[PDB]
Amino acid sequence: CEGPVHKSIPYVLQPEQIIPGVADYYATTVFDGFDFANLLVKTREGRPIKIENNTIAGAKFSANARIHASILGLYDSMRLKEPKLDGKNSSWSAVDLKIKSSLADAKAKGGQVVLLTNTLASPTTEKLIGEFIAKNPNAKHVVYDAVSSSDALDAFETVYGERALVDYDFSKASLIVSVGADFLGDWQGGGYDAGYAKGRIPQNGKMSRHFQFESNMTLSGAAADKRVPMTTADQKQALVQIYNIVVGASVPVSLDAKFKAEVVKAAQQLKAAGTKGILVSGIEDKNAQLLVLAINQALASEAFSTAGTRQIRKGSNAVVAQLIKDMNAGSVHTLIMSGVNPVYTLADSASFVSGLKKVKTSVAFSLKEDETAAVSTIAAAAPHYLESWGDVEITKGTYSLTQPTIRPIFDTKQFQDVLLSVNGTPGNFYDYLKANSGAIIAGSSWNKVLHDGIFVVGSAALAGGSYDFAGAASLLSKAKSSGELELVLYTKTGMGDGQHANNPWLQEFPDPITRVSWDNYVTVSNADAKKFNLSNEIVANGGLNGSYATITTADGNKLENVPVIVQPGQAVGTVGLAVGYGRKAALKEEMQVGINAYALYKNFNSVQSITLAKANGEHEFACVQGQKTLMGRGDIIKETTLEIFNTQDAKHWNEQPMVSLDHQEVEATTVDLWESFDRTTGHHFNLSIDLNACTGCGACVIACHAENNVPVVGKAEVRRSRDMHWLRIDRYYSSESTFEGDNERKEGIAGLSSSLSTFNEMEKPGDNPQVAFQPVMCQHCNHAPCETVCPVAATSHGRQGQNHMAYNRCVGTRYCANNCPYKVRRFNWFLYNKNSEFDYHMNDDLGRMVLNPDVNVRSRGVMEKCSFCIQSTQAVILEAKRQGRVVGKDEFNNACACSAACSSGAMVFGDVNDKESEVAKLAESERMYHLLEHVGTKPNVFYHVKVRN
Amino acid sequence: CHNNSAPNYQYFPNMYESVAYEPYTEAKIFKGGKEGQLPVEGTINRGFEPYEYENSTAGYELAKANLKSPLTEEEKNSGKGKELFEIYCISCHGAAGNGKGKLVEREKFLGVPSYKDREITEGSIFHVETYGLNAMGSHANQLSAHERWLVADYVLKLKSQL
Amino acid sequence: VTYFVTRIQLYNLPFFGAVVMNFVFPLLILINTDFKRLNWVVVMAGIVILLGHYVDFF
Numbered sequence A: 001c002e003g004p005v006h007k008s009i010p011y012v013l014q015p016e017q018i019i020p021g022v023a024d025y026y027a028t029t030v031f032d033g034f035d036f037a038n039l040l041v042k043t044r045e046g047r048p049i050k051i052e053n054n055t056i057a058g059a060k061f062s063a064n065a066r067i068h069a070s071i072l073g074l075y076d077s078m079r080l081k082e083p084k085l086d087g088k089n090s091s092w093s094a095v096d097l098k099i100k101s102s103l104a105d106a107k108a109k110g111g112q113v114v115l116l117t118n119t120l121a122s123p124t125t126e127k128l129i130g131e132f133i134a135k136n137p138n139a140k141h142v143v144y145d146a147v148s149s150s151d152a153l154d155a156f157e158t159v160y161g162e163r164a165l166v167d168y169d170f171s172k173a174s175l176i177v178s179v180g181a182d183f184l185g186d187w188q189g190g191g192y193d194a195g196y197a198k199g200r201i202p203q204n205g206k207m208s209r210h211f212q213f214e215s216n217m218t219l220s221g222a223a224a225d226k227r228v229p230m231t232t233a234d235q236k237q238a239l240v241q242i243y244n245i246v247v248g249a250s251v252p253v254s255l256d257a258k259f260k261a262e263v264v265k266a267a268q269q270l271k272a273a274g275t276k277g278i279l280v281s282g283i284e285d286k287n288a289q290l291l292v293l294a295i296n297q298a299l300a301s302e303a304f305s306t307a308g309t310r311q312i313r314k315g316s317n318a319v320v321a322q323l324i325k326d327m328n329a330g331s332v333h334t335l336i337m338s339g340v341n342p343v344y345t346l347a348d349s350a351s352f353v354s355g356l357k358k359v360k361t362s363v364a365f366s367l368k369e370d371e372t373a374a375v376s377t378i379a380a381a382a383p384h385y386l387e388s389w390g391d392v393e394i395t396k397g398t399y400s401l402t403q404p405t406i407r408p409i410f411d412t413k414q415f416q417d418v419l420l421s422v423n424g425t426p427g428n429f430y431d432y433l434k435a436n437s438g439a440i441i442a443g444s445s446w447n448k449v450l451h452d453g454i455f456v457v458g459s460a461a462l463a464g465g466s467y468d469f470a471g472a473a474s475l476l477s478k479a480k481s482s483g484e485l486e487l488v489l490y491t492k493t494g495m496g497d498g499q500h501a502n503n504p505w506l507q508e509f510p511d512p513i514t515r516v517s518w519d520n521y522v523t524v525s526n527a528d529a530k531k532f533n534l535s536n537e538i539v540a541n542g543g544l545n546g547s548y549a550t551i552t553t554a555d556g557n558k559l560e561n562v563p564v565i566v567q568p569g570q571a572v573g574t575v576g577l578a579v580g581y582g583r584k585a586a587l588k589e590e591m592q593v594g595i596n597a598y599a600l601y602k603n604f605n606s607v608q609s610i611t612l613a614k615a616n617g618e619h620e621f622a623c624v625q626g627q628k629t630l631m632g633r634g635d636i637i638k639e640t641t642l643e644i645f646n647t648q649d650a651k652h653w654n655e656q657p658m659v660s661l662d663h664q665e666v667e668a669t670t671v672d673l674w675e676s677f678d679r680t681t682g683h684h685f686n687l688s689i690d691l692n693a694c695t696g697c698g699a700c701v702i703a704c705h706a707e708n709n710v711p712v713v714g715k716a717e718v719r720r721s722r723d724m725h726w727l728r729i730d731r732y733y734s735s736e737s738t739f740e741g742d743n744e745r746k747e748g749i750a751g752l753s754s755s756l757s758t759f760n761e762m763e764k765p766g767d768n769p770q771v772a773f774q775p776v777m778c779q780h781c782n783h784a785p786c787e788t789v790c791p792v793a794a795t796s797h798g799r800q801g802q803n804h805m806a807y808n809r810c811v812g813t814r815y816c817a818n819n820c821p822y823k824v825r826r827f828n829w830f831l832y833n834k835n836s837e838f839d840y841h842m843n844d845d846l847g848r849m850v851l852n853p854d855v856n857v858r859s860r861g862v863m864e865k866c867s868f869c870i871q872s873t874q875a876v877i878l879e880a881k882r883q884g885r886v887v888g889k890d891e892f893n894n895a896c897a898c899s900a901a902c903s904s905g906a907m908v909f910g911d912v913n914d915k916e917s918e919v920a921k922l923a924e925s926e927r928m929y930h931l932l933e934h935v936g937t938k939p940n941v942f943y944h945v946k947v948r949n
Numbered sequence B: 001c002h003n004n005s006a007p008n009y010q011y012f013p014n015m016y017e018s019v020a021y022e023p024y025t026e027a028k029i030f031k032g033g034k035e036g037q038l039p040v041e042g043t044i045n046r047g048f049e050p051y052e053y054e055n056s057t058a059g060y061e062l063a064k065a066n067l068k069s070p071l072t073e074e075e076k077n078s079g080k081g082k083e084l085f086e087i088y089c090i091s092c093h094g095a096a097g098n099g100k101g102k103l104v105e106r107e108k109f110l111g112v113p114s115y116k117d118r119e120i121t122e123g124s125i126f127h128v129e130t131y132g133l134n135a136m137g138s139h140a141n142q143l144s145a146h147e148r149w150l151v152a153d154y155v156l157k158l159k160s161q162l
Numbered sequence C: 001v002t003y004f005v006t007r008i009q010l011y012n013l014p015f016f017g018a019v020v021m022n023f024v025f026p027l028l029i030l031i032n033t034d035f036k037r038l039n040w041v042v043v044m045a046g047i048v049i050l051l052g053h054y055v056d057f058f
């Protein structure tokens, strides 16, 4: 074939800031009403690519997995490219005139004007809204949250005086008592990962222990030291029992004796740790939240403070309800909303729509023609964050600016620009921001603020006051609703809300706990499964199948749900249900997957009483992980206890394998018939996981699939367990409640009659076991079995110590997937690039901008592998060689995004021959430990030890 | 068979053309036909400050009076300021002399003065080297903001030898 | 693996000499069919083989 003709287009007029081949970084922020963070945007010659974290003295809000995958919304070809009016394509001038004339009529008639939004923490946006209201006599501004937290806000407001949340510092407490907290999840915008993990490292003989009380099962439960299955009717009583101990009081708590046996212990210990303890609870009752405030004041702990309150969640379930009622009751005129989606998130949306039928000039700002854009008057085309200007105040004492990084792709207009035009203010929102920037920024205007991204503002603690908490305690103890089976709604790490309905990276991203993808489900405990005859099963092709079930509530039902029998998932008499998947407007049927459940969020309560019935058919699941338990293989995750760590020699908790010589024992690593190669000079690399800091390691996955151009595979072809992932997080349950209980059944064994029955019972996980996580990638071995058998010699090793993988000689005779004992090697099977069988972002022309040009895209028949960050470390050596310097201490660690994007300090990358780096101080430790040292493969990635107590 | 006015034949081009977007090629989707779309006005990337003086006759002598060199003595005595003058400046101005160059001998275009005639401060080079005075052009596309100051110290050493 | 480590490092000549005597020597002797009929060729080879297998057990 002739081979195509390649052309190149230089500029007519080249801008000073752009150099071809040189990446640029911009300081921006994000806040979409649910998630928020401070971050850097890496851009090419004109466009944004993979999101980095902003760490310039304001590294308080790193990006989560949902934020890292948000770039696909920018390059989504399914966006409202042009605004519509009355269902037809129209100009913005048409929109402007329509809105202005309706406002004039509302003023003349004396009607109602309502703006709807969501937690716009912005000094200048709020000011602008205030100006709108000042000019318009009858404007009400109202805030609507999908998942609400108004009970917490009421408790804080009525004590301290404002609607804000307490930003707890989990690194300043030794005893954490959690009652339905879930602070490692989405609880109050969970960003407490680093705070928690920091206190889990045994630096000396100290370690913060965690007490988990809960109905569901979550990551904080998995990361807890103690976990007590408890229903919501028990949790309320347990909270009062805690209160009576920390705060001397006599309130008649009704609680199960076995529960009291543990609740009392925890409460007494909490009390003992004066100033070093913390009570956190997620009970949807203001009275319960008030008791939490009372107890934390009594403890007077360092983790509790009102000096920097959180401005992120400021809604109200009373105001929203009033709004809905008035839309149907009275006459409401022009309603304008932005980022608000009641149809589908509102449980009473049927009445909301009937309210919409009674209002005039409904204006909705969005990215897609969703369910509310449909039922409206004007569909306004909004910009996607990187196409707009703004400013955000996450906490009480901070100010930050948001820069656009790409010029508007589609014909959009900012919400604030619309407000300025109807107010009669000349210019635009950017000019407005400039004029109002000096009110906060006392330093240099742009040069030291836009350049860095943030600005520091002082603050002060809020005054408290007298309040009858004893009364609240008696109200909570008297409160009681003990009936039948109930469910609890929750959000996921891959699915926070409906802003990522068609995001293929989050659809593919498997659940960190249940290990499944591309679907919703119902969590039922095994004790309940036996009563309802529900079950799951592994089929011949390797995937999972399971029964269907029906959920019935007061005056309603679902009629078809997909249950997963998670053994310890539910305590007893409770059901877990994820909320946020059932979307149908403006998206393809491949993305229209799952169950919504928002209709069950009656009166904004997450806890509902239900009836569960077994259905008729059977469902197939795209399940990623097969086996649930660990077979007693202590040579995989070594665990011990704190007092053993402190009092016993390493020989008793971190023992390495021995091999016999001339009637003598020696460390297995000393036996070798071959000769080694000299890698003592020139940058020998390693990589360090410590298992205490591994909470869920959620956002570490998506950042590794950002440079490396790993394609997206659908529900099928993952259902057959043939997915493409370079690093994976594991999930190991236990039988009989401990990991040491799965090592006493195995070491005590008999001959061939009992060993056919014990190894068949050790794959059924018992009730309330212990959970352990383990990140597994391709540790670049030295005596690597995947090397020697490649007939076409596509793999080799370097002097630095990698496993170099050429994508050229790999003529796919699939040997090297077999000799890897860890077996992390992903052959590709179809062509994932441009065919119509995979209609994801790799196919369409508008969505092939996420792909960086520095890493090639594989075609067919070649294998791929989690290499070390070659495309960054070959640039760090490059940028340290042109200058004439030596590479710094933390310069290798900040470039490889396998380590430079995780929340906690779990992943540590860097140099070893440099004896002053962070890796060389971790390799010389009493917890030095490799996977499978008896194999004799010499890996370059070492894990430490779980040191739970 | 292989011709020289057209590229040669290939055997199964598996990974030869690009799925990603290498910088200067032609595409279809973008605003123009290019692949080098312009950044938004008013933004600031990490490691760059905008020049705060406007164009000539009102910002020229305001830059000539009060504007200084933000370098150190370790960087001036390095010889890298001479190498940038060896590339971007001998084509019109002289190398050791002033105004003799390479192109007033060949008489391609005239009107290049010396450095004895016009008194220039160390901040008046930097305003001309970014904008140009009626026959020069913006050399900001070629040199970087750290490197225009390395040239300006070398030009002052050339005037003192004259 | 130490099975061979302690043999190669200590019994160097015994370990490899047993290969030569039980293979290389007869390889170039009992391939000629005329030599296979000679009494002294057969006796000679027989002696070497016996010594070689003694070494094997040693």
Ligand code: HEC
Residues within 6 Å of the ligand: B088, B089, B091, B092, B093, B111, B112, B113, B118, B120, B124, B125, B128, B129, B133, B134, B135, B136, B137, B139, B151, B155
């Ligand atoms: C040919 C296009 C030239 C290049 C290459 C460089 N210079 Fe120049 N320069 C050129 C002309 C024709 C003039 C005079 C224009 C006029 O209207 O008089 C200049 C002027 C200068 C000056 C004096 C400016 C002043 O205000 O008096 C300086 C100090 C100067 N040029 C510096 C300079 C440097 C540092 C260059 C390398 C980047 C360079 N010139 C290149 C023509 C050309």
Ligand SMILES: *C(=O)CCCCCCCCC
Residues within 6 Å of the ligand: A001, A002, B009, B010, B011
């Ligand atoms: C493009 O059409 C030219 C393909 C050249 C193939 C060369 C084959 C050589 C003999 C097997």
Ligand code: SF4
Residues within 6 Å of the ligand: A778, A779, A780, A781, A784, A785, A786, A787, A803, A819, A820, A821, A822, A823, A824, A825, A865, A937
């Ligand atoms: S871990 Fe698997 S892929 Fe990495 S070197 Fe060892 S065998 Fe090869």
Ligand code: F3S
Residues within 6 Å of the ligand: A786, A789, A790, A791, A792, A793, A794, A795, A809, A810, A811, A812, A813, A814, A815, A816, A817, A862, A863
């Ligand atoms: S052994 Fe070799 S040919 Fe490819 S499948 Fe593995 S690199």
